[PDB]
Amino acid sequence: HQGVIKRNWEYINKFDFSVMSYNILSQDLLEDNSHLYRHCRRPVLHWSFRFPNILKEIKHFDADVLCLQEVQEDHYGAEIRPSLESLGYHCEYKMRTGRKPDGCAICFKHSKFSLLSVNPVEFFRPDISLLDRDNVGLVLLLQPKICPAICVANTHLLYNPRRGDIKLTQLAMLLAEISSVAHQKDGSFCPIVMCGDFNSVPGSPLYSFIKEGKLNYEGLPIGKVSGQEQSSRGQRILSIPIWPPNLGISQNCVYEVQQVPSSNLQHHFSLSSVYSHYFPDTGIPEVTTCHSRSAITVDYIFYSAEGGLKLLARLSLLTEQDLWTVNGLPNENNSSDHLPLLAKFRLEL
Ligand SMILES: [K+]
Ligand SMILES: [K+]
Ligand SMILES: [Mg+2]
């Protein structure tokens, strides 16, 4: 019907599992950035209001795997981890480094998987001046309880729109960890699901690199990498190579043995995006976040596809206009400034 604002399930020897990616908005970061939330009714911003709504959403969708971002450490220990464990999830956390209050969590139903390994990633390198930011990632290797393992990755990349050099290097570090964890004895990669808040928009150079496995970055200004709103003036062009040899990551985004003393990046995965980023009838963009200064897609679920996975269904997203009709995010009903992404996958056996 005209004007309806609804999130629908769109349908596109086996193991079926669902994955939810959700940046839940850290209370400390909300309060530190109160200018982004001026549009919100004051009572809806308190953590005592937001957490029950977030937990209710998680319970409603009952996803097999949760990839969460902006999980605040104190709240995680006091309330989020106990609540998720009560719902049947095993939870693994990786907090941002430094003075930062929040991090990434990957949680999975213990009825659906066993844990093979936990592989945190710290993007902060004290020995590499480029990598001075506190962002992190987390990679789990899971064994379906019934068959290959499944590699689940989660990250929250640097927000700063100018620093595409840092963003691409952080992404390369996550991709290198995935390449090591997902490697199988037969030389192929097990199925991969890579979720997170990439702070980069559809069609940006960083997005295209993920989807295509290649990026020619010759002449690319650092602030054009992510496609986020930027001045697009006075910016340094990416170095060739982007990051120094002491990182120990090659231009194919794999770990390499460092030794004593072209402008293309590659990776070896075949990744698709769950969402197509535009509504087919109208061409209007999908958004995953909507506050006073931004309404864009920055959140993704990427997956191995023709260890391929079949996408069975996804929970449809909304437009910027749809979100302002409900007076933006967070609101009295949606308690993050992001929307949760949700997919159902099939592993054929
Ligand atoms: K390995
Ligand atoms: K610059
Ligand atoms: Mg945020």
> What is the CA(233)–ligand 2 centre distance, in A?
8
CA-CA distance, 343 to 20, in Å (whole number)? 7
Contacts of 37 (CB under 8 A, 6+ apart): 30, 45, 291, 292, 330, 337
Q: Which two three-digit tokens encode residue 323?
A: 């979100």
| Ligand nearest to the Cα of 299, by number | 3
Cis-peptide, bond into residue 126, ω within 30° of zero: no
| Ligand nearest to the Cα of 238, by number | 2
> What is the CA(167)–ligand 1 centre distance, in A?
24
> What is the CA(183)–ligand 1 centre distance, in A?
5
> What is the CA(129)–ligand 2 centre distance, in A?
15
Q: Which two three-digit tokens encode residue 104?
A: 């990434």
Q: Which two three-digit tokens encode residue 215?
A: 């990026």
Q: Which two three-digit tokens encode residue 148?
A: 């290959």
CA-CA distance, 227 to 223, in Å (whole number)? 8
Q: Which two three-digit tokens encode residue 154?
A: 């989660």
DSSP for 16-77, written as a single string: EEEEEEEE---HHHHHHTGGGGTTS-GGGGSHHHHHHHHHHHHHHH--SEEEEEEEEHHHII
* Residue burial 188-205, b: 16+ Cβ < 10 Å; e: rest: ebbbbbbbbbbbbbbebb
Domain that holds residue 110: 1-349
Overall number of domains in the chain: 1
Strand, coil or helix: 202: coil
Contact present, 96 and 122 (Cβ < 8 Å): no
Which approach determined this entry? X-ray
> What is the CA(116)–ligand 1 centre distance, in A?
13
| Ligand nearest to the Cα of 100, by number | 3
Q: Which of 258, 248, 249, 254 is nearest to 267 (CA)?
A: 254
DSSP for 89-123, written as a single string: EEEEEEE-STT--EEEEEEEETTTEEEEEEEEEE-
Contacts of 147 (CB under 8 A, 6+ apart): 15, 347, 349
| Ligand nearest to the Cα of 291, by number | 3
> What is the CA(85)–ligand 3 centre distance, in A?
25
> What is the CA(182)–ligand 1 centre distance, in A?
7
Sign of dihedral through CA atoms 36, 341, 142, 167? Answer: negative
> What is the CA(147)–ligand 3 centre distance, in A?
37
Q: Which two three-digit tokens encode residue 24?
A: 């839940």
Q: Which of 329, 216, 209 is nearest to 268 (CA)?
A: 209
CA-CA distance, 263 to 49, in Å (whole number)? 49
| Ligand nearest to the Cα of 33, by number | 3
Unique residue bearing structure tokens 């506190």: 134
> What is the CA(112)–ligand 2 centre distance, in A?
47
Q: Which of 130, 176, 195, 135 is nearest to 159 (CA)?
A: 135
- What backbone phi and psi angles, to 5 degrees, belong to 205? -55, -40
Task: Please report, for residues 214, 250, 283, the alpha-carbon distance to residue 253 in angstroms, rounded to integers and kept in the order given.
Answer: 10, 5, 33
| Ligand nearest to the Cα of 179, by number | 1
CA-CA distance, 65 to 76, in Å (whole number)? 17
CA-CA distance, 117 to 330, in Å (whole number)? 35
Q: Which two three-digit tokens encode residue 114?
A: 């066993």
Q: Which two three-digit tokens encode residue 164?
A: 């595409």
Tell me the sheet residues that pair with 314: 10, 343
CA-CA distance, 277 to 6, in Å (whole number)? 16
> What is the CA(300)–ligand 3 centre distance, in A?
15
Contact present, 100 and 134 (Cβ < 8 Å): yes
H helix count then E strand count, the chain:
7, 17
Q: Determine how β-strand 65-72 pairs with β-strand 271-273.
A: unpaired
Contact present, 54 and 336 (Cβ < 8 Å): yes
Contacts of 138 (CB under 8 A, 6+ apart): 92, 93, 94, 104, 105, 106, 118, 119, 120, 121, 153, 154, 155
> What is the CA(45)–ligand 2 centre distance, in A?
35
Q: Which residues keep their CB under 5 angstroms from ion ligand 2?
A: 235-236
Q: Which two three-digit tokens encode residue 232?
A: 């697009």
| Ligand nearest to the Cα of 231, by number | 2
Task: Please report, for residues 103, 123, 310, 311, the alpha-carbon distance to residue 287 in angstroms, rounded to integers and kept in the order given.
Answer: 22, 27, 24, 20
> What is the CA(159)–ligand 2 centre distance, in A?
15
Q: Which of 188, 159, 194, 189 is nearest to 174 (CA)?
A: 194
> What is the CA(64)–ligand 1 centre distance, in A?
26
Instruction: Determine which helix (DSSP H) or strand (DSSP E) holds 295, and give its type and residue range.
Output: strand 294-296
Query: Taking the C-alpha atoms of 137, 143, 145 and 146 in order, what is their torsion angle to the nearest 10 degrees?
Result: 140
Q: Determine how β-strand 150-156 pairs with β-strand 192-197.
A: parallel
The CA R_g of the chain, rounded to the nearest whole Å, is 19
CA-CA distance, 349 to 123, in Å (whole number)? 36
